[PDB]
């Protein structure tokens, strides 16, 4: 079968596959990431994500936990800055009460003050653990040192805001950012019919569009963090294309040309122009890749390096020089064809799993209200052509950069030197 | 409605198992019944070392050539080694099976053994592998539970062997434990079984363990947290009661209190690993022992149900994706000799009730002597008499 995406007049779009698979999954996609926050509610989103277990105006936290557990179902709340999605997974027989629990959570939080209060200690941890991988700190700092207002807001709650987030604020967010028109309910394992018959009840309530989407403004800059780690992490990005343009496809082809993760375990990722350009000069251990994060109004594209503090300089320079070569037209058509094959294989393996398929449909829904068959994409990625890739490169090599560095930064260069 | 997991065999004895699915990409892998259990303490890091050297150089392809190509095709190349099985698998667009299979053929035979560098890599990482406290705890829960057997020794081996290894030794392990009847070519996703069988015919057609109730305590008080694992003897891989034990684990589910049922060929480790601040280690232990005991004498149909359902949502399937499935196909052909379908798993789950769960839990957990492995500030971790006395109720 195929998804059938239908936009209920309330604005919510319903879509299902009913693969008749054993464990059906259903997820609500609501544009409610930190992006949609503002300066005085920093943190609301984080808590909201960890507070999927607070008594709902219809169910006790106890039942919520026990109920979902009993049926073996699972409710998870992923969240990016551009958006956020709640997801329930389970047996086709128990997904009626799973939709009861999920739709109660999404549309009716009691946000009891005592309850929310109990969570702020759990909040410290998340923001904390997620930072184990230095990468997190970097990407966060990066999106921050790079943007001014909207996409600069962190995914994790700041240290001063813990103890200050109140139930009111949370409720405020939902009623404001979590409205119907900004949501979409995609379900794999259910009948499109019922989705309409269980959303027409709870979701169509918040009919308004919702708080305006704060636009995002680029700022440039660099934030560094001397913390004495063994490895220097450094991300250097610039402004790039947004969601909904062919230049975003050009930038995706550009990161798969430059290198977007190893395909072989213990490989050296030989092809990566970056990896090759670093490895021809530096014998130290390193990890150089291309970073691309595009949101519906703005995108960041650049390079990400992990290296020994000492070599941190020229390695970064070598990586930067490689991108400048791509900005000068120094590329081959076989390399671009291999980059396109890598990108399309990555897309197909991303959508080959059930939860990735449900997320993709979800994202497409909120983003364009339409479903784009995997096939369609393949021919559009093919549309990207060599010159297009080169173009995106020059955008990066010219646009003001934003640099987030961490480690022993005694030999890490600056932007005016880079 | 449900895949078939059509499997065949070839001259060599290599099996060719596949489970077609509508997903588009595929995960084609080679499993081999060769791990650290088949090593004889003179080649204790040969399998791990081989992997490091493997994926890098070969007979038809020089050095990066394979790595270079798989990137060229857009596939992800992965390999792993356990105490009993070794796997080399590629996730790739189905259409590329033709090369996803020829590449795998080189990796299993015609491989070219860099050795110096990989030695350094393995050694250095090991120098830091100590950072993975949990792996440490679990490689002693193995040493102290299987003392004197080839199941005590780790997959990586001791630095000693790593340094002292040569091409010929490797060649031996390669030529000894890479036999065709001990090999499964597993494919999951958008693959046709007849095409995969023809490709396997074209390429690749050339191919008393004992548990000792004991205790190891690595005390190092400078670490902030303590990791403790307590296990008893798991039934095995083929033992039917494994399923009633999985339900028991689903009933149990201080801190990071995970539960494990590691299975090897007619043996295993069934238990719990928990990390806690030192001061609470004893209370955790007491808590944990009470629970095992709860199941042994006081189960409840309701909770069993909770356990059966969670187990029901763990079974791996096309939804989980190609790799997860392949991996299951390779392990099922290596261990059971067949791919157990999900309907048989559901039947074995629904036949489990509370009475046979507390019977099987009394069979294993009750009164048997455990293996204990602690690392960190573990002074308040109780010694063996207190844990052994907590293994039963008066």
């Amino acid at each position: 079968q195929d998804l059938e995406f239908t936009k209920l007049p309330n604005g919510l779009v319903i879509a299902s596959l009913e693969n008749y698979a054993p464990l059906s999954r259903i997820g609500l996609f609501v544009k409610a990431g930190s992006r949609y926050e503002d300066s005085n509610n920093l943190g609301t989103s984080h808590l909201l994500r960890l507070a999927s277990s607070l008594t709902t105006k219809g169910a006790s936290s106890f039942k919520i936990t026990r109920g979902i557990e009993a049926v073996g179902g699972k409710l998870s709340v992923t969240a990016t800055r551009e958006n956020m999605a709640y997801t329930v997974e389970g047996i086709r027989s128990d997904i009626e009460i799973l939709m009861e629990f999920l739709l109660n959570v999404t549309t009716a939080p009691e946000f009891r003050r005592w309850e929310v209060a109990a969570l702020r200690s759990q909040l410290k941890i998340d923001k904390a653990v997620a930072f184990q991988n230095s990468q997190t700190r970097i990407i966060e700092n990066l999106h921050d040192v790079a943007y001014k207002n909207a996409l600069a807001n962190p995914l994790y709650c700041p240290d001063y805001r813990m103890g200050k987030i109140t139930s009111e604020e949370l409720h405020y967010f939902v009623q404001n950012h979590f409205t119907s028109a900004r949501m979409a309910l995609v379900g794999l394992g259910v009948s499109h019919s019922v989705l309409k018959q269980v959303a027409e009840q709870f979701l169509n309530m918040r009919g308004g569009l919702g708080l305006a989407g704060a636009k995002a403004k680029y700022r440039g800059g660099e934030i560094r963090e001397q913390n004495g780690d063994n490895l220097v992490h450094a991300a250097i990005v610039a402004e790039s294309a947004a969601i909904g343009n062919a230049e975003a496809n050009a930038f995706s082809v550009l990161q798969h040309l430059l290198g977007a993760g190893p395909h072989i375990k213990r490989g050296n990722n030989t092809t990566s122009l970056l990896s090759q350009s670093v490895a021809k000069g530096s014998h130290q251990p390193f990890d150089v890749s291309a970073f691309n994060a595009s949101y519906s109004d703005s995108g960041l594209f650049g390079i990400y390096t992990i290296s020994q503090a000492a070599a941190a300089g020229e390695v970064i320079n070598a990586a930067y020089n490689q991108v400048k070569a791509v900005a000068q037209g120094n590329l081959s058509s076989a390399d671009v064809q291999a980059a396109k094959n890598k990108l399309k294989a990555g897309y197909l393996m991303s959508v080959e799993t059930s939860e990735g398929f449900l997320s993709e449909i979800g994202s497409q829904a909120l983003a364009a209200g339409s479903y784009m068959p995997p096939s369609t994409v393949l021919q559009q990625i093919d549309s990207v052509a060599d010159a297009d890739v080169v173009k995106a490169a020059k955008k990066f090599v010219s646009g003001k950069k934003s640099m987030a560095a961490s480690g022993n930064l005694g030999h890490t260069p600056f932007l005016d030197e880079l | 409605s449900v895949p078939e997991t059509q499997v065949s065999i070839l001259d060599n004895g290599l099996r060719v198992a596949s489970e077609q699915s509508s997903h588009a990409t595929c995960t084609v892998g080679v499993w081999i019944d060769a791990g650290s259990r088949y090593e004889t303490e003179k080649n204790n890091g040969a399998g791990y070392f081989l992997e490091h050297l493997a994926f890098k150089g070969t007979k038809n392809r020089p050095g990066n050539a394979l790595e270079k190509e798989v990137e060229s095709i857009g596939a992800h190349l992965n390999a792993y080694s356990t105490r009993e099985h070794t796997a080399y698998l590629i996730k790739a667009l189905s259409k590329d099976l033709p090369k996803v299979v020829e590449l795998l053929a080189d990796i299993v035979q015609n491989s070219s053994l860099q050795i110096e560098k990989e030695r350094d890599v393995i050694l250095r990482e090991m120098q830091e592998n100590d950072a993975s406290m949990q792996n440490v705890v679990f490689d002693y829960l193995h040493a102290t539970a299987f003392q004197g057997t080839p199941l005590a020794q780790a997959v990586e081996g001791p630095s000693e062997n790593v340094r002292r290894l040569s091409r010929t030794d490797l060649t031996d392990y390669l030529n000894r434990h890479y036999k065709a009847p001990r090999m499964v070519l597993a494919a999951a996703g958008g693959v046709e079984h007849q095409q995969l069988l023809d490709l396997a015919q074209k390429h690749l057609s050339s191919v008393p363990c004992r548990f000792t109730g004991s205790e190891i305590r690595h005390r190092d008080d400078a670490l902030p947290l303590a990791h403790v694992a307590i296990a008893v003897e798991g039934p095995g891989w083929a033992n039917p009661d494994n399923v009633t034990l999985q339900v028991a684990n689903a009933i149990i589910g201080c801190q990071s209190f995970q539960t494990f049922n590691i299975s090897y060929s007619d043996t295993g480790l069934l238990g719990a690993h928990f990390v806690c601040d030192a001061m609470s280690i004893d209370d955790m232990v007491f808590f944990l022992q009470g629970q095992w005991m709860r199941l042994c004498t006081s189960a409840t149909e309701s909770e069993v149900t909770r356990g059966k359902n969670i187990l029901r949502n763990a079974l791996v399937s096309h939804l989980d994706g190609t790799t997860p499935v392949c991996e299951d196909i390779g392990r099922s052909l290596l261990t059971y000799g067949r791919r157990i379908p999900l309907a048989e798993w559901e039947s074995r789950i629904q036949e489990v009730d509370a009475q046979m769960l507390r019977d099987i839990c009394s069979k294993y957990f009750y009164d048997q002597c455990p293996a204990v492995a602690g690392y960190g500030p573990i002074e308040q971790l109780p010694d063996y008499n207190r844990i052994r006395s907590g293994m039963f109720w008066l």
């Binding site: 998870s76 990016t80 990407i139 990890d287 | -």
Partner: peptide, 28 residues
């Protein structure tokens, strides 16, 4: 101590993940 502690460099945006299930982490 980041409660219960655990190198691959991030190349994609991050996505927090928490919920009823015990596991919770971030991916690039």
């Amino acid at each position: 101590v980041l409660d219960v502690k655990r190198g691959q460099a991030a190349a994609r945006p991050l996505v927090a993940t928490v919920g009823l299930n015990v596991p919770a982490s971030v991916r690039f």
